[PDB]
Amino acid sequence: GKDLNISLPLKTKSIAPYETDVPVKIGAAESLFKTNDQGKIEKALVKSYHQPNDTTLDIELKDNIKFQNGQKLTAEKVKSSLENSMKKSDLVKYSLPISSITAKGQKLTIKTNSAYPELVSELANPFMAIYDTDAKSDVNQTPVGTGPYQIKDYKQSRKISLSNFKDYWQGKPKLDHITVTYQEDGNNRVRNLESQKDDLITDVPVNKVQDIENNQNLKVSKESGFRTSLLMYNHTNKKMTKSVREALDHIIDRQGIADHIYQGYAKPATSPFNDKIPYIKEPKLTKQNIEQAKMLLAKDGYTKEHPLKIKLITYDGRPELSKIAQVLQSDAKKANIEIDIKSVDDIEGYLKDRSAWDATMYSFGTIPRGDTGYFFNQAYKKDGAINKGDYNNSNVDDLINQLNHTVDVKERHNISNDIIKLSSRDVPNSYIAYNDQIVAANSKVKNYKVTPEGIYLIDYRTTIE
Ligand SMILES: N[C@@H](Cc1c[nH]c[nH+]1)C(=O)O
Ligand SMILES: N[C@@H](Cc1c[nH]c[nH+]1)C(=O)O
Ligand code: NI
């Protein structure tokens, strides 16, 4: 009827908002701030804010917003939600250096110990979405948000069932029910859409695009966005030296990968950040050079007789990652590297054991809210939530820490470019492609989001006609 079936990759365990962005994606939860369709920060739950000095953020919340259980969204609810999220998540904690929060009625005041210009921006992060900390349910299964669709049932790592929240603050949502099921294999997601098992899918394999476009019952939406695919190195394994990382960097054929594996739905990458961000000074594009790789590996003593052995992790959710792994393995052989590919079902959980991998295929939204700070803090600082390989260089640390308290935007751009230049010398990861997000749907599904931040999907206007 007016029910929507969504098929997503990257199955979750907990679906607390501070564990995954899935509750924001599927319309269950909202952050205080958001980005609009052009990527700019906007008030969402907030009516007004002021910044009277560089350590003070005064917020007045909208007065007409309820949680899905009917409880009013107040300043005290926001305070308790934020403090809980900071307590329970390293990602949230390291993004929000908040020193104190006071609340009364609809007003709260957030303090920092020193200037942190990206505070408002990080309050738009979906991991900072607001939920009712007093709800009598398990926030890991059925968090209570302000979104248009309330989570009613969660089968862990398999299925999320949501129902229309009729009192949703922006307007009456247009669907009755949503069912979200996880499917890691992109080809399976496409088959589910074709057989009408599901109505809306993300992360369409590039080689199925034409097939879907040919179908008059279906439609494809594509967006260049700001997701980067990469080869992430485990810096805690002493064999993963600078020479080894340089060598693997030169076994990659970025141009070939973009043309043939992404079939043109991507561009060759250099830094973490899409070059369509105008202030970014990218490092020089690395072109494939097997001889150079062989030479570099000679430095550490590797030969055809005694090759480097690499355990490379991959996963299906982003469909092109394992295709890249396959051709890396084939090409690396020519350079005296024997790569073992291990595909895993739960990539975030698997990488926690740093004894179990040498490198991994990976994909991340490296600049979701227009600033490079978030990526640096989460990926290049020790204990950052996506620094799976524990890269850390005190000289890069120093610049990141300076960036974090830098207010002048031109100076933020300069420091960010210095961070990019300096860190690139270490090859902390090998950035492979800036690739498009491709979504597909039954043609009767209307008004889902496919916008450049690559987070949002369902809102109160999404519908079926
Ligand atoms: N960050 C990786 C792995 C992941 C699993 N779940 C969320 N993320 C990706 O999005 O592809
Ligand atoms: N899946 C999102 C968010 C995330 C946090 N940690 C891992 N992933 C991304 O890759 O951008
Ligand atoms: Ni991710």
| Backbone phi, psi, residue 384, to 5° | -60, 145
CATH code linked to domain 1-223+437-465: 3.40.190.10
Q: 3-class SS at 3?
A: strand
Q: Which amino acid is at 402?
A: Q
The token pair that represents 322 in the structure block:
């394992």
Distance (Å, whole) CA 279 – CA 263 = 27
Return the ∠ at Cα 92 (arms to 65 and 227), rounded to 5°. Answer: 95
Give the CA distances from residue 223 to residues 22, 105, 349, 464, in Å, rounded to whole numbers and listed in that order.
19, 41, 29, 22
Does 346 sit in the ligand 1 pocket, CB within 6 Å? no
Atom in ligand 1 nearest the alpha carbon of residue 363: 11
Q: Which amino acid is at 259?
A: D
Q: Reported resolution in A? A: 1.9
User: What's the gap in Å between 315 CA and the centre of ligand 1?
Assistant: 9
Report how far Cα 361 is from the mean position of its chain's Cα atoms.
14
H helix count then E strand count, the chain: 14, 19
Burial class (CB in 10 A: 0-12, 13-18, 19+), 43: middle
Residues contacting residue 409 through CB under 8 Å, at least 6 positions apart: none
Partners of 222 in beta bridges: 438
Answer yes or no: same fold for 1-223+437-465 and 224-436: no
Q: 3-class SS at 254?
A: helix
State the DSSP code for 257.
I
Does 21 sit in the ligand 2 pocket, CB within 6 Å? yes
State the DSSP code for 167.
T
Half-sphere exposure of residue 89, counting CA atoms within 13 Å on the CB side? Answer: 27
User: What's the gap in Å between 362 CA and the centre of ligand 3?
Assistant: 8
Does 12 sit in the ligand 1 pocket, CB within 6 Å? no
Give the CA distances from residue 271 to residues 75, 381, 382, 434, in Å, rounded to whole numbers and listed in that order.
40, 16, 19, 10
Reading phi first (left if > 0) and then psi (alpha if -120 to 50, else beta), residue 353 is in beta
Which residue stretches of 19-127 are H helix?
Answer: 22-25, 75-88, 90-95, 119-122
Give the CA distances from residue 163 to residues 5, 35, 93, 173, in Å, rounded to whole numbers and listed in that order.
12, 25, 31, 10
Domain residue ranges in the chain: 1-223+437-465, 224-436
The closest residue, in CA terms, to atom 9 on ligand 1 is 363
The token pair that represents 10 in the structure block:
């990257």
Residue 172 neighbours by CB distance under 10 Å = 11
Residue 40 neighbours by CB distance under 10 Å = 10
Picking from 15, 132, 123, 126, the residue whose alpha carbon sits closest to that of residue 66 is 132
Report the first-to-last Cα separation within the chain, whole angstroms: 10
Atom in ligand 2 nearest the alpha carbon of residue 363: 10
Distance (Å, whole) CA 190 – CA 204 = 7
- 160, 152 Cβ separation under 8 angstroms: no
Picking from 157, 187, 194, the residue whose alpha carbon sits closest to that of residue 19 is 157
| Backbone phi, psi, residue 135, to 5° | -65, 140
- 120, 49 Cβ separation under 8 angstroms: yes
The closest residue, in CA terms, to atom 9 on ligand 2 is 364
The token pair that represents 59 in the structure block:
């917020």
Closest ligand to the CA of 363 = 1
Report how far Cα 156 is from the mean position of its chain's Cα atoms.
21
Distance (Å, whole) CA 193 – CA 313 = 28
Right CATH for 224-436 from 1.10.10.10, 3.30.530.20, 3.10.105.10, 3.30.310.10: 3.10.105.10
Residue where the block lists tokens 């600049």: 367
User: What's the gap in Å between 315 CA and the centre of ligand 3?
Assistant: 12
Q: Is the dihedral of CA 323, 327, 330, 335 positive or negative?
A: negative
* Interior/surface letters 264-274, b for 16+ CB within 10 angstroms, e for the rest: ebbbbbbbbbb
Partners of 150 in beta bridges: 163
- 187, 200 Cβ separation under 8 angstroms: no
Q: 3-class SS at 97?
A: coil
User: What's the gap in Å between 387 CA and the centre of ligand 1?
Assistant: 13
Give the CA distances from residue 67 to residues 30, 146, 219, 222, in Å, rounded to whole numbers and listed in that order.
10, 4, 34, 33
Distance (Å, whole) CA 260 – CA 234 = 28
Give the CA distances from residue 74 to residues 45, 80, 81, 113, in Å, rounded to whole numbers and listed in that order.
10, 10, 11, 25
| Beta strand segments in 214-320, E | 218-233, 266-268, 308-314
Residues contacting residue 135 through CB under 8 Å, at least 6 positions apart: 67, 69, 71, 143, 144
Q: Which amino acid is at 108?
A: L
Residues contacting residue 397 through CB under 8 Å, at least 6 positions apart: 381, 382
Ordered DSSP codes for 333-390: HTTTEEEEEEE-S-HHHHTT-TTS-SEEEEEEES-TTS-SHHHIIIIISTT-TT-TT-
Give the CA distances from residue 359 to residues 10, 75, 96, 268, 362, in Å, rounded to whole numbers and listed in that order.
19, 44, 29, 20, 9
Give the CA distances from residue 65 to residues 34, 78, 80, 128, 168, in Å, rounded to whole numbers and listed in that order.
16, 12, 16, 17, 8
